[PDB]
Structures are given as structure tokens and as C-alpha cells.
Symmetry: D3
């Protein structure tokens, strides 16, 4: 029994939930859901793992999107069908600005559309802009936690390699369009790359859905250290604490 | 004297770092008179500039004229003079049935139906407002009890075809814009105006802060032409909001 | 009155079918004063409009302000008012080493580096001047004896990055425009300005006649901004003589 | 532990393999592997589950891509880093031609690029084309198996909904560009919609890698479970047999 | 021998010519040349047939381009290599405005770039604009010949069928882009369709060569000798 | 004057039931391709469109030139399809851009980089300029039958011979921004060669239910110094022509 093609969920399964937290990794779903009351596994199909839970007496969904806009668009669409109206994406990310450290938290106001799925919802002229309420909740939750936060634009790429101008690859080549592109995003003040927000934010802002995006900085292109596992795990839980507190303000 | 178009010098600004940029040169005077020590600085072309003081802090008011090109000149030369924050105040025609004339719109980002924004960033880049600025605008409109709508604005290089107006000399709109208004409407776009895409883009991609607020004068979905007195209170209302917002950003 | 921006009525025009359209409102009166019976009409925003008379015919002078968007407003509403021929007089930056400040440039067509022209025709459509208007402009220029250059113009939505000026706040220009000036120059492009692409496209694609002429106030192969200070009535007298031939 | 960032694989894991079969669904990896000799699990991370097997004494990889071009581009790139030079996508699909029925097998010569990831590898003018040897192998194996086979173009979309012009959705609207697009693909002779091939074929064709695609039609858009299953098993047999001819 | 790859012409063959009249049809070259002094056949390769004649004691070239921008661009480049600096195209065309009649002469000021080759010389933003002295000579020649002449914008298409929105084809299909395009061109005041001017004009205007465009109307979509005489007389004025 | 089509000057009767056409660019090459077949006979010649009929294993086959470029290619293909042709085999010569490809080698195109304008008149840029599988198979097999050294892959199809193939030895010596550094990119992407008709041919056929294939003889290598004389070039041309005819046999 399922009301949607991919997620293997019913409207009944949601228990009146209208907000979902949407990480990329199916394995981070339970860990996120465990921070709320009465966490319970719902379904798991392909890259879509969903759990339901409770915040302040209200039902909340946690569901993975997988990597990239296409699978993200499927989860967002099918959750919307089942009644979700607010989406909070939590992620990890690599920063392209020197002044941003591993451990910091990024809140995305809007994304550069280096994806394709967003164009399936709005013409490129349309802004991949986050919901103001969502962004406010995220920024506020970050501050009441004491996290060092940066708010601004994020480049959202359909690839991990060429679209983020990595040259350490099989071909060692990046297509004309992306040559010298990172230095250009940096000069334009772009904070980071990730791979889902352009699709998420465009498809929501153009369909009367609310969307927010927050991420933990676990690496920095422009820095020379690495550094290590324990801070990456620590920062991750920061962002996770943050997205849950934000969700609390939006219920 | 220092910049080509505005005819202003670094000295004229008095260490001012924030600017309110209306479109109408004739509205500059008024906005500035709402603050302490209003003083006229210059007037060239569509650029009239005044200095004023807000909580003891120098602030500039400078008209942009209609459209991205002249806006982009005003902002650039002001940034050259030290301005880092820009708050646009304007008038708009709502295109959502639920938005009544006299409402206040705060723009988080704009649909880029202009050309000047492309001179700063490729189309993929979001014409997104600065968070602090948008927050200040929202909190000002609320503290003043204005019915506020917060969302996306379609920013057009034309008043007529780009906003799909057919009541014209030619009566035709180019293919790309045939059926575009209903599209924007279905997408939740609040309104049309003609500067924010250039503004938000050129600021967000150059390390400058920008926000925009506007008062609704018309509604492309309602039939009653607005009351000549409501439009006036609304404008002064949007103007009250932008001035209050600037205080938070000083 | 009859229109949303200009504050004009058909009556104000007095049967005028031609308009001279400069950018700066503060020189509308100065152009009007070259003709007979100049009378100010209106002034709202960047649109200052005057009426004059040339060889016993009514002529309008109305400023566009800087850029296609306000130009598109002026042109459209003037058209509603009955204007069918538009002659733009402007200032410009030369990108060819041999063009002197004070020279008169007549534009056959423009490189569309704007956005407003796209609101009238797809990019494939040429931003081309009306041939009668261009002939009148060239013929009038030959009458005056001005050092004149005829050809293509780059029309930009910005004064700075779109014309590849680097002396700016950021000192950077977006990828699209890096090394663009050199390319227009190699293509034989004469100059930069900010309104002709919009004007010529919206007119050529709506059955309206349009001409374009400008005085050089900077050579960009030398510097980004004029000194200047400076101090071309030549282009202005040419646009008036031209309008004379088109009445 | 790992030579790549996502797949969690080292070169040793491939045991010299140069060919990978790439399904989308991580849970179909075992079943495909199970058709070959000495099938063994390798790793599972995110949507990337990988198995190794053997075909006529040669090491073969099966690795899922997840849904869509972005994750696909990661799987292919990292596998290429591990030494894979030939990629065969196996899939399920919905036909958009009236003459293409469920149970049929489609071999894709090239794809309509309705995705974003292909552009990170080559400009839009570049063909998202399959490698000829792979296509030959897939076609010949299908003929060997007796499958009703269609060889041609496929539409590859970054979405399952608007990009395939579905309206039975939360918004009930499809963006301008995709309005009436299905009927156009149909009149152009396009066989089907799926979600990975544009990325897969473009990134391979522009990087000296071989790629091909076969899929089973389980559904027709213009108009049961057990016959859906029996079809997939046949398209799966097809890809495995084609793999043999490419080793 | 030849100094160029396709035309099979030598610089010597031009005898100093600096102006070319460029028809589309190779079979039309001889006819045009025979309206001038001392017409001599030069070469004939692929769709490029070239003659030399003499006009007012000046060497002039007549060279066919074939149909379409690509071969047109080959002929122009290779003629420019041989010293040609001025190109006048003479063509046939279908008018798309009710007021233009078959037998009328059209002079093109600029073209809608519905082609590909023009993009090999300038970005789409660049106008496919004709040279002013050439357009002037064509317009003044038209008066001399006594032809009903319209001056304005031409739609230059890479195809004869779908790009001119013809549906009477094998497929009966025209691609999204060109569905409803003819009516829009008409509403924009576009005069006619043809297939070479966008390329010709763009490549000349962006490379410092002079080009002009004139054509006889052979059909009107809403329902050649003059044009040839005009192009020859205009060539006189440009020597 | 008896033609069912606007340009070609051909009637259906002329085809005598033919359903396949060989479509070279050069009008002068039509006669010589038909000469590899039985009972060849000239049908017509108008503009750059010269056509012959001939027999292959007892079946009527058309040979018709397209002229240089997608526009006249698009006319020749459309009007022949009207006449009944359903399969098109283009044979050309080409300049290779890969060092490993030798002059005299033969290229079979699986799909083309669309550096043309005519293709867009049949399908948006997203659509692949891809060859029919049967035709490509026929050409590859035929290449083996003849014994040619064959490469199969992607071709760059450009609307110009000069700036679009990044040639600088020109009147202007200028190459527009889009094409600056393009040959090096195509090379890096594995593209085999440049030519000027295939993007149009392949797109219009693949998006209109027609079959099309592309084979070419390499008469020059852009990466190499030495340029072969007409003798070895004519020799190359012969091989490709033999291959297109042999390939046609398998498609009848
Ligand atoms: O380099 C120059 C010189 C003059 N102009 C210019 N660029 O653009 C034109 C603007 O409308 C206006 C802005 O200065 O004046 C024109
Ligand atoms: O509608 C028309 C009518 C005539 N022409 C045309 N389009 O294009 C020109 C081609 O060179 C050639 C193709 O028929 O003839 C010209
Ligand atoms: K995925
Ligand atoms: K203005
Ligand atoms: K040709």
C-alpha cells in the first residue's frame, strides 16, 4: 500500500505531518529522527528512507533525498502529494571562502543554479530562493546554539567533479563552461558547493512550498589542513541540532 | 566631482555607509525630510542625491531612475564612495488576487527579466536580497503594523510587453512574454517592478547588501482603480518602513 | 495625462509625428531652442518633454533617461501619442583608435547587449535603424561638414562592466564581458552607448522609424572616463537638420 | 580501504575489471550479479551498491547509480578512476510510442539531453551518443534472446514529473518549456523517457569511455506486475549477454 | 590552378577585381556577367561558378554561392582572400507581407538570423546589418531601373521548409521554435524569407567587408531581371 | 517541366521505386559514385543538386548531391523523402583532428556535434544528431569488406569551413569567441574530424522517421605537417565511395 510511486508511503503514514527534514544520506535519517519524540521507521526504497517523529506534539517526517536534484525532486514532489508543505534540507558542505572554517554552519539564502532539475519547474530567470520564515528559523536556531554562522549564496552543482572544477579526475579535464568558474564564484561571494539546493529551492519557491537549507562545513578547498574525523562528526551534529530547533519554530 | 554621473565626492557622504534608493528623483527630497538634518547634495540626469542623519549616522538618499541600467550606475558610483548597504523603496502592481492595494511587499529575490543583472553574474546566479536587509524590512513593516507579503518579485526591463500589457500602440507582445503573467502567478510571484533584479544581483555578487520594499498601488487581478488617497498613505507607509529598516542596519 | 509616465496629451503634440529623443532631461530645452516656438510641455521623472516647430511642423523633444527600460517607456507612450519617427541624439564612447572626441557617429545597427530589446523581438532580430532616418542623418552630417563615422554600435545595459570598465568598486567584470571590448573592436564596432539597441529593436519590430546619432566624448582605447571637462552641438545640429528632412 | 571518495572501493576490489553494468536501483545489483559466475558483494554507500562477478573468466562490476544524472556521474567517474572503461546501463522504462509495447526491449543509440549533468562534460551541441560496440552488443544479444527490440532515441529527464510532462501532481502544472513536449518527442520518433542516459552517454562519449543502454518496457504512457518482472529479467539477461561480447 | 580551396580561382584570374556580385544559382552567373563588358568564364567547382566581366573599365566578379549560409561563407571568405572587398547578393525571395507583390524588388537593411553560419562570425547579439553605401547604391539603382522597391528587414532561414514554416512536407511537422513564427515575423514588419543574407551580412559587417542585398519577389506567402539590372547598376556606383 | 519537387527537378517515376539515396556533397561526385553501380543514368541537374539513378543487386538506387552545408542538404533530403526515399547514406571527405587517425583512413559517424543552424529547424539542441543503427552497422561492415582502416565515433559538423573549424589562415585571421580554443576541446573530447553536413542530415532524419548514415574519407590531418597530393586523396575518396555503395547493398 502506497499513495506515491517511489516513496512507498501513504498519507496515513504521515499522521498529519506538514513539515519534513530532508537530508541526502539515507543513513542519517534515523539519527536525525532520534532527536525527536516517538521516532518510527516508515519506509525505505531506493535512496528514499523515511521515518516519522514528533516535535512538541506535532508529527514530523524525516526522509532522505539521495544525491542530486533528480531524486530530490521525486522525494519533494511525493511528500508534497502526501501533505508536506515545509521542507528543511540539512547537509554537510565544502566551503570555497577562506574565512569560513570547518565546523562553521552555512544557511543558504539562495543558490546558483548549476543543475538541470530546477529548470523543470521554472525558467533560469527564476531565483532558487529560500523561504524567509525557514531561513529565519535556521539562522535563529543557529544563534541560540552559539554556532558560528554564515548566511548567503550557495553554488548547487549537478556534478561533484567538473561542476565544482575538480581536476583530479580520470580525464583531468573540465568543460569550457566550468574552467575558471570556482574563482568566479569566490569573487562573487559564493560560500560553498553542494548538489541539491538549487532543485529544492526553485521547485518549492515556484510551487507554494516553503524550503530552507542549512549545512555544516566539514571541508574547505582554500585551506591547507584537512583535518579530521571527530570535528566532522561534531559539526554534523551541530547542523542537526540546528535543523530540529528550526523545525520547531515552523510547526 | 569624484564620480562621473552622480557629481558627488567621498566628502559629501560624511562617512555614510547606507543608501536608500528610490526610483523617482522627486521622491528623494521627501524620504530625506523624514530624517534629521536633510541636505541636498546634487542632481544630475535622473540622479538626485540627498544626505541625512539617522540616529546620528549619515545616510544617503539617491534616486535610481527607472530600470536596471541607471540603477547600476547609481549603485556602482555610490559603492565607489563607500556605500555598502542599499535599500530600495518603490511602488508596485500586485499580480496575486490575495494582495490588496495598500499592502507592503518585501522581496527575498527577483525573477530576472532584465539585462543589466547579466552584466554582473550569469543567469544561474540568484537575484537574492541580503538577509539582514530583508529581516530589517520585515521587522519594520511588522512593528508599524503593515500587512506584509514576503516573497518573489518579477523584475522587468519594460513596463509594457515584459509585464504582458496589450493596451499599447502595437498591441502585440513578443512570443517569450505571451502567457507569462499567468505563469508567474501560478509560480507565486507577488508583483512586477523594474529595478530589483539589477539591484539584488549586482549587490549579492559584489559583497554589497541590498533589500527592497514596495507599496502596492495597483492589482492586475482586481478591477477597481485605486483610491487617490490610499495610494498616498501607502507610499508614505512603505517609506516609513524603509527608514525604520535603515536604522537597524546603521 | 493620456499616458502613464510622460504626463502628456495628444493635444500637447500639436500633430507632431517626429520626436528627437536625448537621454539627459537637462538638454531637451537646449535642443528645443534650436527650432521655432519652443514650449515646455512636462517633466516627470527622467522624462522632460518640449515642443518646437520646424519648417512649420510640430516637433517633440523628449528625454529617455539612461538605458533601454526608460527609453522603452518614452518611445511607447510617445507612439501612443502619435509619434511615428524617433531620432535619438546621444553621447558615446569610441572604441576605434582613429575616432576623435567631437566626431559624429551614425548607427546603422546595434549589438544588443541589453535586455529591453528582447521584450520586443528575439535576439535573432536585428537592432537596425530605419534607412530613411539613417540617410537623413548621413546627408545632414555631410551638410554640416562634421567628421562623421557610420556603422555598428555596441549598446550596453551598463556603463561599467558591460562596456568592460575595470576602474570600479570590484574592479572585476563577469565572464561574458571579459575581453569583449577587444572583440567588438576587431569586428569593426564603432562605439558604446546604452539606448540604441532597445530603441532600434522596438521601433524596427513595431512599424516605427528610428535613427541613431551620437557625439564622441571619450575614446576608450585611451581611457575609461573623460577628464574632461570637456567641453558637440555638431551632433545636435545634425539631428535637427535630419528631422527637417523627415518631416 | 578506498581509492575513491564515494563508492568505498579500491582498485584491488575490481580484480582487473574494465566493464561495469550500471542499474539505478541498489537492490537490483545482487540479482544482476547472480546471473554471472562467482558473484560477490563489494560495498554499499549512499545509493552506491557494488558487486563483482565473472564472465568467461573475466572480472565484471555491477554498481548502482541511484536515480538521476548527478549520482550517476559520481559512480561512473569513480569507477573510471578504478579502471572501468565500458559502462552498460540496464533499466526499466515507460514507452511513449504507440508501437512500443510492454515486454519490448529498447536499445538507446542516443538521448535527448533534458538534464543538467551532461553540460558539466560537454556543451549542448555535443551528442549524448552511445558507443557503437556496446550498442551492437546489446542489439545482437537481444536478437539472440528473441526479444522484440527497438533501437533509437530516448528522452533523458532530470525529473520524473514535469520533465516527462506529468500533470497528476501536487501543483498540477508543468513549466512552459515542457508544456506539449511529450507530443513533440513522440512526433520526433523518440521511444521513451528515463533519467540517467543523457548524463551517462555524454560523460562517456566525451571522455574516451564506452557506454550503452538497454531497458525493458513495463509500461506505455499513451495508454501487470508478473509480466513486468518477466520483462526485466529478460532485459537483464540481455545486458549480461552483451557484456560477454564486450569483455 | 587555384589560390583558394573550393572556388578553383587564382588571384590573377580576378585581374584586380574588388567587387563581386554573388547570385545563388550557378546557372545564373553567365546571364548576369553577360550584361557587362568582356565577360569571360573563370571556373566552375561544386556549386561555385565564377565569371569575370568589366564595368566602366573595372574588373568585376560574378560568383554563385549555392543555397545557404555555409557555402555562401566559403565563397565570400575565398573571394576576400583574392582581394574582393565588396559583395552584392542578388536573389529570389518569398514576400510575407500582403502589400508586397510578386515582381517587386526588395532591398535588405538587416536580417533576422535564423541561420547557423552567422554565429561563426559574431554572437547572436550582433546585427546582420548591410553596409550603408551598398544599401544606398541598391536603392538608388532601383530608381534608375524603375522597379517597385521596398526597403527593410529580411528573415534569413537555414531551411526552405520548416524554418519558413511550411507544413506541406514529408513529416508535416514543424519544430516548436518555428510554430507560429511566420505570423510573428509579419507582425514585426519583416518583408520576406530567404536563405543567405543573415550569413552574408553578419560575416561582412564583422570583418570589414561591404555587403548589399537585393532580391526579386517570386511568390507571396499570404496569397529577377529588374533585380539583376539593379544589382549591376548598383555595382557601377560602388566601383 | 515535370518535377514533383521544387528544387531537384525529379518525379517519382524517375526513382523507379528507389527507397535509398547516396547523398554526397559535390555535384561532380554523383556520376562517379553511380559508376560503382549498375546501369547508371543521369536524372537531373539543377543548382547544386545533380541526381543519377543506378541499380544495386537489381534494385533502384538514387545518388543525389546536397551541395556544401545543412541548408541545401535539408532541401535535398526533404524533397527526396517526398519522392519516396527513406534511407540516406552520406559519403564525404574530411579533415581529421586526432593524431592517431591517418590520411586514407575511413570514418563512420555515430553522431555529430551540432555546430550548424539547420538542425535546430528540426529539433532543439538537446536532441542528438545521431545516425540510424542499421545504416551505421552497414557502413562498418562494408568498411571491413573493403578492408579499410576504420574509426567509428563523433564528428564535429560546422556551418563554416573556416572559423567554425578554428582556422586562422583567413582574410581576417579572426575567430569569434565561441570558437577560440574549440578544436583543442573537441580533440580532448575524442571528436574525430570536422565536416559540414552531418549534423543537419542526422538530426532531420532521426527526428522525422528517416534513416541516415555518414561515412567519410580522411584526405587530411589537421595535426600533421605533410599534406597529400590529389593522387592519394583521390585514392582515399575511392575507398570511402566503395564502402558507401557496399553499405547500401545491405540496406535494400
Ligand atoms: O562611455 C560612454 C559615454 C557616454 N555614454 C555612454 N557610455 O553610455 C550612454 C549613457 O546613456 C550615458 C551615460 O553616461 O551617456 C552615454
Ligand atoms: O522562399 C524563398 C524563395 C526563394 N529563395 C529562398 N527562399 O531562399 C533562397 C535560396 O537561395 C533559394 C532556394 O530556393 O532561392 C531563394
Ligand atoms: K540519487
Ligand atoms: K532611466
Ligand atoms: K550549398
Amino acid at each position: 500500500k502506497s499513495d506515491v510511486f517511489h516513496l512507498g508511503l501513504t498519507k496515513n503514514d504521515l499522521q498529519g505531518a506538514q513539515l519534513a527534514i530532508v537530508p541526502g544520506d539515507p543513513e542519517r535519517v534515523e539519527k536525525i529522527a532520534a532527536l525527536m519524540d516517538k521516532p518510527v521507521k516508515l519506509a525505505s526504497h531506493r535512496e528514499f528512507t523515511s521515518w516519522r517523529a514528533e516535535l512538541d506534539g506535532k508529527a514530523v517526517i524525516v526522509c532522505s533525498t539521495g544525491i542530486g536534484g533528480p531524486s530530490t525532486s521525486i522525494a519533494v514532489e511525493e511528500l508534497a502529494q502526501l501533505g508536506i508543505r515545509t521542507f528543511l534540507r540539512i547537509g554537510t558542505t565544502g566551503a570555497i571562502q577562506p574565512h569560513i572554517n570547518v565546523g562553521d554552519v552555512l544557511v543558504t539564502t539562495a543558490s546558483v543554479r548549476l543543475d538541470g532539475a530546477s529548470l523543470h519547474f521554472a525558467p533560469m530567470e527564476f531565483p532558487a530562493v529560500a523561504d524567509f520564515a525557514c531561513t529565519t528559523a535556521l539562522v535563529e536556531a543557529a544563534k541560540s546554539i552559539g554556532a558560528t554562522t554564515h548566511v548567503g549564496v550557495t553554488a548547487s552543482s549537478d556534478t561533484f567533479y567538473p561542476g565544482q572544477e575538480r581536476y583530479d579526475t580520470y580525464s583531468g579535464r573540465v568543460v569550457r563552461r566550468f574552467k575558471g568558474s570556482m574563482e568566479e564564484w569566490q569573487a562573487m561571494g559564493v560560500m560553498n558547493y553542494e548538489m541539491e539546493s538549487a532543485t529544492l529551492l526553485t521547485m518549492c519557491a515556484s510551487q507554494g512550498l516553503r524550503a530552507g537549507m542549512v549545512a555544516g562545513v566539514i571541508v574547505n578547498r582554500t585551506q591547507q589542513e584537512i583535518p579530521n574525523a571527530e570535528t566532522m562528526k561534531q559539526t554534523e551534529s551541530h547542523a542537526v541540532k540546528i535543523v530540529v530547533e528550526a523545525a520547531r519554530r515552523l510547526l
